[PDB]
Structure formats: C-alpha cells, structure tokens
Assembly symmetry: C2
Homo-oligomer: 138 residues x 2
C-alpha cells in the first residue's frame, strides 16, 4: 500500500519487493532503493513533472499524512542496515520529520502528483527516494 | 471523460450513454438522467459518503474547475429538451453558475470524493444529478 501504481507499473522500495515483484521485474536499482514491477491493471497515480520541494507524505508509524520540506535529490552516504551495507544512495531528498522502522513505503506527493517514496530515516530526518526523473513510468 | 469510474462501473448521463454503455448496461434511470455500465478495468474514483453541499466541478465549455454551493437533492420540474420531455427529475441539486450545452458530464467533487455529475443547466443555474445514495457503486 506502500507502492506507487502508474500505468501498468508498481513502484516499491527495492528492500521491500515481494517475490511476485521480482517474478514480474521491469527495473530495479539498489543505489536508489527502487524496484518497478509489471501490473495487470492500470494504476491511479501520476508522477509529478515538476521540481517541487515541499509536499505531503503518509507516515506509517503515525497513520497520518504530514506536510514536509525536503532538499533537492543528492548523493547521500547511508549507514549499514539490515537491508544494505553502508553505501552511497543517489536521488535522495531529506526532510526534518518523524521516522521509525516501517515508515519506508510511505508516498510523498505535491500538487503535481507523486514525488517520491520514503526509503530512509534516522537522526530526525526522513529520506525520500525521488521518482520524478522516471518519465518512462507515465 | 464526462464519466465517473468506480470499481468496475462507469457512470454517465443517460442522455449521453454510448451503444457500448447499453451493451454493457448495469443500471439506468431516466428520472435521474443516470446510466451505469460495466467495465473491464478498475476505476480511480470514490463516491462521497457525506452530505456536503459545497464542492468543485469541471465546466466543459470553460475548460476550468469552479468552486460551487448547491442545494440538497430535490424533485425539480425540468422543461422539455432534445433529450427528454418536460418531466420531474429527482435527486437534482442546483447551483448558481455558468452553464452551456455540452457541460453535461462534468464531475462534481468535495473532499470526500465524487458528489454528482452535471445534468441540467439554464437560467443561471447548473443542476447536478446526485450519486451519493448509490452505495452499491463503491
Ligand atoms: Zn510538484
Ligand atoms: Zn463531502
């Protein structure tokens, strides 16, 4: 539910992908924590064609939507976790905000449509993986 | 595009239905100017489960969305047109607003989802056919 559905695509955190995701793989990138898989049914979401840097996301741990201001996508060194070794993550946008394990998957939106998806968190920051350059999705 | 798509339903003005609409008929009611037909693909709209009486609709002739205040659904005598004889139309909600032939089909929405669809117009009023009682749709 922590997925973007655009066209015949389902976009998820790569660390959260299901076996069925991999069985219907379209595209994946560890350095971004993104995986896209094929769908049978047409999705309801649109990808934002803008450079907005404020928006609203869904926080899973709080079950609320929050307004947020987030930095332009950058290369960020992200510490080791149970999902990845310490590595450079690209396309990562950071906001001051509540963050708990399980928040990954939460969808970030602006008036133009979907901006990104929660991927990282810690130290009082929420990191969203930007999807706006993925023009092939829409 | 002047259609509501909810579940596997397509909801249209009955006077605008296509032959394919009738070939896949689920439900229709002349007294409301509504027709619902079957779809292959899951729709993106939700029906408003509320009694809101202000909202926004799309005006076809102006190609703009407009904010509107509309009366509670009533039985309204509607004059003869090329589509119906003079008759009582039920479930009809009226707002002061721009209206031209071709505006029928425009979708009215509030924060809870889809409220109604433009059905009538004239004398400085826009009449929307309420769909909120159609709970079987969602
Ligand atoms: Zn935007
Ligand atoms: Zn409402």
């Amino acid at each position: 539910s922590g997925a973007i559905y655009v066209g015949n695509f389902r976009v998820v955190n790569r660390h959260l992908a299901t076996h069925n995701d991999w069985a219907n793989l379209v595209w994946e990138d560890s350095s971004r924590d993104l995986l896209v898989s094929s769908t049978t049914a047409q999705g309801c979401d649109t990808i934002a064609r803008c450079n907005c840097q404020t928006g609203v996301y869904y926080c899973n741990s709080r079950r609320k939507h929050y307004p947020v201001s987030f930095s332009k996508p950058s290369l960020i060194y992200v510490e080791a976790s149970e999902y990845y070794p310490a590595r450079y993550q690209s396309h990562l946008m950071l906001a001051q905000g509540h963050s708990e394990p399980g928040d990954a998957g939460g969808i970030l939106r602006c008036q133009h449509g979907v901006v990104g998806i929660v991927s990282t968190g810690g130290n009082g920051l929420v990191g969203f993986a930007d999807v706006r350059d993925l023009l092939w999705l829409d």
